Design a protein around this ligand. Structure first.
Ligand SMILES: Nc1ncnc2c1ncn2[C@@H]1O[C@H](COP(=O)(O)OP(=O)(O)CP(=O)(O)O)[C@@H](O)[C@H]1O
Ligand SMILES: [Ca+2]
Ligand SMILES: [Ca+2]
Ligand SMILES: [Ca+2]
Ligand SMILES: [K+]
Length: 968
């Protein structure tokens, strides 16, 4: 169906629905059975990055050398392409495997928190899943809700209705809707002002309509078909900078070896020698270039996102992970975010006697802490019947009629309809029973709305003035049923607008001494151990005429609140979440300065920061907290200075929340806002990272880079930890390959400078890449979090990636790894059991091999080109670089406190590589391409003896790191 133009009567008759009741269970069934619910090569390809493009060229030019039918050896040339291609597809499959597991955790998280919608059906308004909405349902949504499906407006409960069409049309400015018909069918969607389209957000107003499209038939579903954190741009620069350094050395090695082209090992020709050293340069390039750098990125990000899904935290922005790591300060909302978001009225007071500055007191306490309509009114450990007091009856009238706020039969609990703060005013009226009406004969769903239904019948609701966050009050005007204005709002804001007080039923003007009697108790409830929210309850006994008043401007409603009469004030208890006290404590240990940006009273906010940990109980607050009205009354010199020191902000308007973030960003402070309502939407947008609770508004979820299905605030601390756990893993990844592959460069330069036969065959240089730089390097993405991961200071994006001291340890480790594999091959010539005994100053020039060269006779003939030194160099090179992989588990922590088995993915990786190293040397057909199996008894005891002290070379510098930890 495409019924859009015609009036509301014909579209309701098309579906055969009633606006009051709605569809039934069997009518939704058929409609659900007719339209339905309401809702590989590129995957494998990780090869798009620049570094992968190099080995693909190196694998092709190596494939061309094998096409010449010689390759210096018919079987050896065939191995060079496979060694290069195996490491590329291996790192690709592992990275896709983690993206495979990452997509499996996101889909399971979608089932954990399905989108919700507010509907009217035959079985009060109820909320169900968004996919169960069928065409014909009656849907009523308010400010902050996301439009679930295409809806034809049938009624508007406000003076205006604004809808944000930024997702569908691209218009950032909201447009005003209406229930009037439109003339033309095929007009553009921007001219359709009587339709609510899915995906759009409600900017202002509260409307109710009928659904005309679901699932695929949705208007936004028609078009829906068809870089990360400059660190990666820096990594793309790092990959480009490191490649040019390697490219400069490889072309230099080919020039250094220009004099060795004519050696007899190559065949006695410059062409025969240039090709062999051209393969040396290519084998050195492929070995030195990091292969799994694009793979460790996907590995760490797919590991982190899958760890966040385990803790039930949605990540809507992929790059927003490591931005959390560099977060300097975090500022979060209080209500719903730092509290358990459970409102219930526990205390209440009115005025008893007033004379001059002397005023008396009375305190009414409410038992029970739930949303259930059961409780007892008590005063001084004694029950109180609230029928005698006319002030409590008028107080109950304010709590009931100025509010628009259902028993769950499945779980057997009462759930709130609307906001939680207003819901506590509803259950408060039910507990009073001011008119002494019998409540036992009614059912549970009838008991929860029993006392409010009686007041609704006694006093008719004429019209309502919407709540605004700037004037901090909600005004309603009532009239007895057969043909009074009373307002509730902020205590410090309404009492100033109250010029009268009603002692019992007698109204007398406001006394400045009695005004302070009320505020002192409000502060004691706010700053006490209870930390209660207070709501001033007033009534305007000189109500203005209806049409004499204007409802177009919400800011003009302050004139309508002049000459109020104070009735009373109620207290509400919303305990903080049991994990928030530890969250700020770990944020203090991580250098993150926690800020509380809320709109409630400062007396309530400063008492929280003392309980939670933002402020110490022994700490005093001199200039570390300000109200919104005090924040604007500070000189510009102290205006910015307060943003750096103050860890709490109260009574701020939604326009001031976005500014506080802007003042922090001016000092280059990385911020993170956590909010639940549309109040925080300008702040969530403006901030670097936005956080919205799972029970928060959908507008806050859209602007937030994270959504917490489990609204526990402890996830924020673990979220910053994971962004800091991907950073150090990328450090250990670069820490491993650089410090190891520099020794590969030191190896080749040392053999030429010392005067020994060159270290390894180009195939022997490509093999160590497949073993040392492959799956052992990718397994570093699975490293466990470091011991000091949440105590070390945060990251500054202005500073370079590699520190000055870290560049030193890259060389210090590279000097030993390079000299160990050369000294191993040197050991075979100097003193070897199975080898010759030829020292005589290492016979620095080995080029003299025949015949019985004078003054170097030699015990035997020329034994160069023998595999025993070459394999000795590779046996240690593979072994010493596996011992270096154990050093990359932590940054500065000793290995006796970070055991090697903390990373299970690496231990099994080294055993697979060492077995692959052993499978290669010991299986008879393989040592033709490779050269010769070494000795088992004596050599491996020497390989282990040489490859072991590299662990000592690393832990002694961690001792220096444990002595003092500075970048340098
Ligand atoms: N619906 C309502 N009617 C009357 N007064 C309200 C009200 N909602 C809040 N107030 C009061 O107005 C003052 C302003 O509160 P505001 O709504 O601007 O921030 P908040 O802290 O309540 C939202 P958050 O959950 O994000 O912390 C509060 O002190 C509150 O007591
Ligand atoms: Ca490599
Ligand atoms: Ca909130
Ligand atoms: Ca290597
Ligand atoms: K943002």
């Amino acid at each position: 169906e495409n019924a859009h133009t015609k009036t509301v009567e014909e579209v309701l008759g098309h579906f055969g629905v009633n606006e009051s009741t709605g569809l039934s269970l069997e009518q939704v069934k058929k409609l659900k059975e007719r339209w339905g619910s309401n809702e590989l090569e590129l995957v494998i390809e990780q090869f798009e990055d620049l570094l992968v493009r190099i080995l693909l060229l190196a694998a092709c030019i190596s494939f061309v050398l094998a096409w010449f039918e010689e390759g210096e050896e018919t079987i050896t040339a065939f191995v060079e392409p496979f060694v290069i291609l195996l490491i590329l597809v291996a790192n690709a499959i592992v990275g896709v495997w983690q993206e495979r597991n990452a997509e499996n955790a996101i889909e399971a998280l979608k089932e954990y928190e399905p989108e919700m919608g507010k509907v009217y059906r035959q079985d009060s308004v109820q909320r169900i899943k968004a996919k169960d909405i069928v065409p014909g349902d009656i849907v009523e949504i308010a400010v902050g809700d996301k439009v679930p499906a295409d809806i034809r407006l049938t009624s508007i409960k406000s003076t205006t209705l604004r809808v944000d069409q930024s997702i569908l049309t691209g218009e950032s400015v909201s447009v005003i809707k209406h229930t009037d018909p439109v003339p033309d069918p095929r007009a553009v969607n921007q001219d359709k002002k009587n339709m609510l389209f899915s995906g759009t957000n409600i900017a202002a107003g509260k409307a109710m309509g009928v659904v005309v499209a679901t699932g695929v038939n949705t208007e936004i579903g028609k078009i829906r078909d068809e870089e990360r954190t400059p660190l990666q741009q820096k990594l793309d620069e790092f990959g480009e900078q490191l490649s040019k350094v390697i490219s400069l050395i490889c072309i230099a090695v080919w020039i250094i070896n220009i004099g060795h082209f004519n050696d007899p090992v190559h065949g006695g020709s410059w062409i025969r020698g240039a090709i062999y050293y051209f393969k040396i340069a290519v084998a050195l390039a492929v070995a030195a270039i990091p292969e799994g750098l694009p793979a460790v990125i996907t590995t760490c990000l797919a590991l982190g996102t899958r760890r966040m899904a385990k803790k039930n935290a949605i990540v809507r922005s992929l790059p927003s992970v490591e931005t959390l790591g560099c977060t300097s300060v975090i500022c979060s909302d209080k209500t719903g975010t730092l509290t358990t978001n459970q409102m219930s009225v526990c205390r209440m007071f009115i005025l008893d006697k007033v004379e001059g500055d002397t005023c008396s007191l009375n305190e009414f306490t409410i038992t029970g802490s739930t949303y259930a309509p059961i409780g007892e009114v008590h005063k001084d450990d004694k029950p109180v019947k609230c029928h005698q007091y006319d002030g409590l009856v008028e107080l109950a009238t304010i709590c009931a009629l100025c509010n628009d706020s259902d028993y769950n039969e499945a779980k057997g609990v009462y759930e709130k309809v609307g906001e939680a703060t207003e819901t506590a005013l509803t259950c408060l009226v039910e507990k009073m029973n001011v008119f002494d009406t019998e409540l036992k004969g009614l059912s549970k769903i009838e008991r929860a709305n029993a006392c409010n239904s009686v007041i609704k019948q006694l006093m008719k609701k004429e019209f309502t003035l919407e709540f605004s966050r700037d004037r901090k009050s909600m005004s309603v005007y009532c009239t007895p049923n057969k043909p009074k204005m009373f307002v509730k709002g902020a205590p410090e804001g309404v009492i100033d607008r109250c010029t009268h007080i009603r002692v019992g039923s007698t109204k007398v003007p406001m006394t400045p001494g009695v005004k302070q009697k009320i505020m002192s108790v409000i502060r004691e409830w706010g700053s006490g151990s209870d930390t209660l929210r207070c709501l001033a309850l007033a009534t305007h006994d000189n109500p203005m005429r209806r049409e004499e008043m204007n409802l177009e401007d919400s800011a003009n409603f302050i004139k309508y609140e002049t000459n109020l009469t104070f009735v009373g004030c109620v207290g509400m208890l919303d305990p903080p979440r049991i994990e928030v006290a530890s969250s700020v404590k770990l944020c203090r240990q991580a250098g993150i300065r926690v800020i509380m940006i809320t709109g409630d009273n400062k007396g309530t906010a400063v008492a929280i920061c003392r309980r939670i940990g933002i402020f110490g109980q022994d700490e005093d607050v001199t200039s570390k907290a300000f109200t919104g009205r005090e924040f604007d009354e500070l000189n510009p010199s102290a205006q910015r200075e307060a943003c750096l020191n103050a860890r709490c902000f109260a009574r701020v308007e939604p326009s001031h929340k976005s500014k506080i973030v802007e003042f922090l960003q001016s000092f280059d402070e990385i911020t993170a806002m956590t909010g639940d309502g549309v109040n925080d939407a300008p702040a969530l947008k403006k901030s670097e990272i936005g956080i919205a609770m799972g029970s928060g508004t959908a507008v806050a979820k859209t602007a937030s880079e994270m959504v917490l299905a489990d609204d526990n605030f402890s996830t924020i601390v673990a979220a910053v930890e994971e962004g800091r756990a991907i950073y150090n893993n990328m450090k250990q990844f670069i820490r491993y390959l650089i410090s190891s592959n520099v020794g590969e460069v030191v190896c080749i330069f040392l053999t030429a400078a010392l005067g020994f036969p060159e270290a390894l065959i180009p195939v022997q240089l490509l093999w160590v890449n497949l073993v040392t730089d492959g799956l052992p390097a990718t397994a570093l993405g699975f490293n466990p979090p470091d011991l000091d991961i949440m105590n070390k200071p945060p990251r500054n994006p202005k500073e370079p990636l590699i520190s000055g001291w870290l560049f030193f340890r890259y060389l210090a480790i590279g000097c030993y790894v390079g000299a160990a594999t050369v000294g191993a091959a040197a050991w075979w010539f100097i003193a070897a059991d199975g080898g010759p005994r030829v020292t005589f100053y290492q016979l620095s020039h080995f080029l003299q091999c025949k015949e019985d060269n004078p003054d170097f006779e030699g015990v035997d003939c020329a034994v160069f080109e023998s595999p025993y030194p070459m394999t000795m160099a590779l046996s240690v090179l593979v072994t010493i670089e596996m011992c270096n992989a154990l050093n990359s588990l932590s940054e500065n922590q000793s290995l006796l406190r970070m055991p090697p088995w903390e990373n299970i993915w690496l231990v099994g990786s080294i055993c697979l590589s060492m077995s692959l190293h052993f499978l290669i040397l010991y299986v008879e057909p393989l040592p033709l391409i490779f050269q010769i199996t070494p000795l088992n008894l004596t050599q491996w005891l020497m390989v282990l003896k040489i490859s072991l002290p590299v662990i000592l070379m690393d832990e002694t510098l961690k001792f220096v790191a444990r002595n003092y930890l500075e970048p340098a």
